[PDB]
DNA sequence: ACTTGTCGGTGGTCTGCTCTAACGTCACGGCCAACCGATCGGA
């Protein structure tokens, strides 16, 4: 399918799970991971996808399935995922209006755009 | 008593060689762990600790040891 | 021991000269065969003469799950190994090496063949160590030791102890008597939880009929799409791409059709009948 | 199976080794029942799914096949047939003994049937079959009468 | 028992493969014979094989034999559905063909009929709603019950059953109590008294 | 990474749609990416992702009645992402604080925004 | 899950949660009034058996009058 | 409607033939654990040669590990001399 | 006295079953059924009631398919279907075969009827 | 340019196999305890 679809499906699945989902169940359940030729290509691809997700900022925790289970799975802490509450609205308008005016460094402008988009997704 | 009787009937514990022996004596009961109401409320057992003095004798060397052993509730 | 070693060497040399060798003289072949047979007889004689230490060693392990004769046989296997590994040059008597091997074999076998649910030896050792530490703590403190004390005195987490204690449970028997007389058993109070309730089945059949009647209020396209997508047709659902390829339409079109059909089905006139089935 | 009115007779008889190994779907080789960790049946044990059948419905041991469309096939990796879980009360196993063993019913009975058949006292049978006395199976009388 | 048989068979295989002296092999063969005998019939020869608590194990012959065996306990007599049990009192106003059945007991016995009948009368939209109404004991259930038990005989039995007249069919009538009302003239057949 | 930006954009777009009641098409096509042509292509891909099983009632839903894009099913995606440690938040805070303009929103806007952002991070 | 159950849950929106209800319910033919609740928790240092985390006991009291079928003597 | 499948024929060492139903897109194993409990190969002229397992430790290997060739040769020579003297005087 | 009807009254239509033999449990505390013992079977045989006894043994205790079919027929209002084969008989046959006994059911022709229906 | 499959590596835990050299050498923990009739193996 598509890499973006795999990433989005993985994010949603790890968000909605209640216990640590092992990678073996991730292969069969999450769409896009079932088209790999062998178990090593899937393993490397899943490792790279985990690295990308962790570098992005999404909290991807690895831990045991449960007390009496030696399997090791992955989850995403929904409480640590973000912070819902936001402050006033008048100050945020001034912050956005001054978010970026003349900066040219790609990292700076990308970071400012990401922050503005997250603020819009959390109200204005 | 019953405990004294069973300890006396078991006091000499010697091996085949006859060089070592173990003896038990002086059964003693301490205070109760908890009252009846506490035991019934918390699902416990109304019991008291039991301590028996055990003495070890090594016949060949003649050196003897004695300690107070806890036998249970 | 010297006879055993001589017989083994003679057998090996005879085997080597049999294939890619030379025509051995008749007397040489006779002597090699005699030495091999003498070595086998000496090995058997040593085994039989030492088949009394095994019983003494196994006497102390009676009453711990395994039977006395099984312990004796495992000790006999250990004795065979000890005979195989005994070296006479060191000058020590056979009763030490034999004791070591017999004890090892008996302990390993009792670790393996004594539980209905088998536990690996590396964990049976941990369970035994935990029990010994618990006994020592009980003697020292005077009270029953809590998991905290065992955690400190066993240099393990205070959680692994719970798992270890929960792995030590032995299954009870379904044939044990419950009452005073001999008419009741534990297996008569156990409910089969995988049997058909005989009421959920008819309810499911009626639900299928009602759902078919409700879905027959739509057009052929939407009904077919829903049946293919949810797997209501025979046994299993399909995916957007597969249904689109079967119907020759893009996946976005299939998604739009499904969204419209689901919106139509949420109308009360199509869900009031099905409300009571959920 | 169905139509109890179609049952004409109920015959009983001795079962030979051929019948015993024709009933069985496999041989059990290990005294294991379930795994102490996953609580899952072992392989070639007393609860092996490859021999007796799946614990789940339409599911194999390794989980490769989990659908009704895979009916009547055998998984190429775990060897478990994909069928209903109710076959676990219809399939038998067998154990291949390394030495023949007599049936207790036909030896320790009153009257003993092996003793009547072989004209041997029950004490002689108990001595023989429990490894306490040797018995001459056959003797070459022609050779003895010549030398 | 199967585990013992398998363990001894495997040990015998190992001993035979190694080449052990005949004494050990003979002992192992005798143990295998004893294990198989204990599997088929535990106790006929020698001492019974016991588990925890010095309780002898249960073999196949023990399954097939005795009053608690397979035949007598599970083939010549079974436990059945649609059956109840209660204390009996005396109803002198009943007829010889009538009995007094408690309303709750009759409701539980006739639940499958009551569900259908109260679905038909449009008291419930489907089977699940009718089952919920029966479980909650709604006021409109009882009327339906009086329709379903009419001219539907029930068999009354009192143990021990010494002759045929220990099981008799009666026409039920709903009563407000929890005790079955029995006709005074059928006691001698049942050998029943109201104590 | 040119895929990571899209992924973050979608992960914020879904909560944005769920938090603005019946946002018209033009507002989305002007706010989250000026190119409105790719907005439809991104909505089509969002319509395909959802909960495991990927059956109706598990994928995310929408209503394209007209210009308003409303979400009826979110598949758990309701909150936005957290501002990553340093990076975006660090740059935004640095720009907000190191402003070289004489105060115009200083009294109760700039300081309040700075304090609230610092507390949120 | 069955396809019909999945379709019904999709229609009504009730998401299927991987938890099974095992609530303590009053047995058949029993009733009364709740007069006492006793709660034990491992996190509060209660001597519960191994594996058990929480325990709760409920006492239900009922006043019974004399009725047909009761035995007097 | 059922999934198409193939039937493989396996032969054990002691003249036993068995049928195993496999799927189409699956690697049919050359050797299989048959119903009798004995491993049996598949009937094919082009044999997919499986792995070869070498024998494990034996008594001679341990003896040679713990004793050199010279000592064993000397012991054998002494035993041969003893039996020669006992036999032919 | 401590013999009250509230603790004695019990009734059941369908509930939990056993594991080895698919028969209803026993006891008020388990929503079990009433035992129809051998004496009751003798009474039914003396009465001449073949059908009542047959249905009691088959479709109220052991006929696994028969129980659900009877419940469905009662709910939908059709006739009660014919009984099948009790599970206890199949359990007995397996227990006999495990004792190296060759028990086989023969049809009128003389062949063997397999008990692996399903 | 980004992705992706084959290749190769570090570190960790669960599981199974092998070895340990003073001398040591032929099991217990325990009833059974009715009371009748039938029957096979001894004397
Ligand atoms: Zn499989």
Curated annotation (Swiss-Prot), chain B:
Family note: Belongs to the RNA polymerase beta chain family.
Subunit structure: The RNAP catalytic core consists of 2 alpha, 1 beta, 1 beta' and 1 omega subunit. When a sigma factor is associated with the core the holoenzyme is formed, which can initiate transcription. Interacts with RbpA, which partially restores Rif-inhibited transcription.
The organism's place on the tree of life at top rank: Bacteria
Function: DNA-dependent RNA polymerase catalyzes the transcription of DNA into RNA using the four ribonucleoside triphosphates as substrates. This subunit often mutates to generate rifampicin (Rif) resistance. Interaction with RbpA partially restores Rif-inhibited transcription; once the subunit is Rif-resistant however RbpA no longer stimulates transcription.
Region of the whole protein represented: 75 to 147 of 1169
Species annotation: Mycolicibacterium smegmatis (strain ATCC 700084 / mc(2)155)
Name of protein: DNA-directed RNA polymerase subunit beta
Note: Mutations in the RRDR sequence (residues 423-449) confer rifampicin (Rif) resistance. Rif blocks transcription initiation but not elongation.
From Swiss-Prot, chain E:
Disulphide connectivity of cysteines: none
Protein name, UniProt field: DNA-directed RNA polymerase subunit beta'
Binding site for Mg(2+): 193, 195
Subunit structure: The RNAP catalytic core consists of 2 alpha, 1 beta, 1 beta' and 1 omega subunit. When a sigma factor is associated with the core the holoenzyme is formed, which can initiate transcription.
Species: Mycolicibacterium smegmatis (strain ATCC 700084 / mc(2)155)
Parent-record interval covered: 343 to 537 of 1317
Membership in a protein family: Belongs to the RNA polymerase beta' chain family.
Described purpose of this protein according to its UniProt entry: DNA-dependent RNA polymerase catalyzes the transcription of DNA into RNA using the four ribonucleoside triphosphates as substrates.
UniProtKB/Swiss-Prot annotation, chain H:
Transcription listed as a keyword: yes
Biological process according to GO: positive regulation of DNA-templated transcription; response to antibiotic
Entry's induction text: Constitutively expressed during growth, increases slightly in stationary phase (at protein level).
Domain of life the protein comes from: Bacteria
Keywords: Antibiotic resistance, Transcription, Transcription regulation
GO molecular function: bacterial-type RNA polymerase core enzyme binding
Function summary: Binds to RNA polymerase (RNAP), probably stimulating transcriptions from principal, but not alternative sigma factor promoters. Partially restores transcription in the presence of rifampicin (Rif) in vitro; overexpression leads to an increase in the Rif tolerance in vivo, with smaller colonies. Seems to act by removing Rif from its binding site and preventing its further binding. No longer stimulates transcription in Rif-resistant RNA polymerase (with mutations in rpoB).
Record text on subunit structure and interactions: Monomer. Forms a complex with the RNAP catalytic core, specifically with the beta subunit (RpoB); its binding site may overlap with that of Rif. May bind free principal sigma factors.
Similarity section: Belongs to the RNA polymerase-binding protein RbpA family.
Protein name: RNA polymerase-binding protein RbpA
Species lineage: Bacteria, Bacillati, Actinomycetota, Actinomycetes, Mycobacteriales
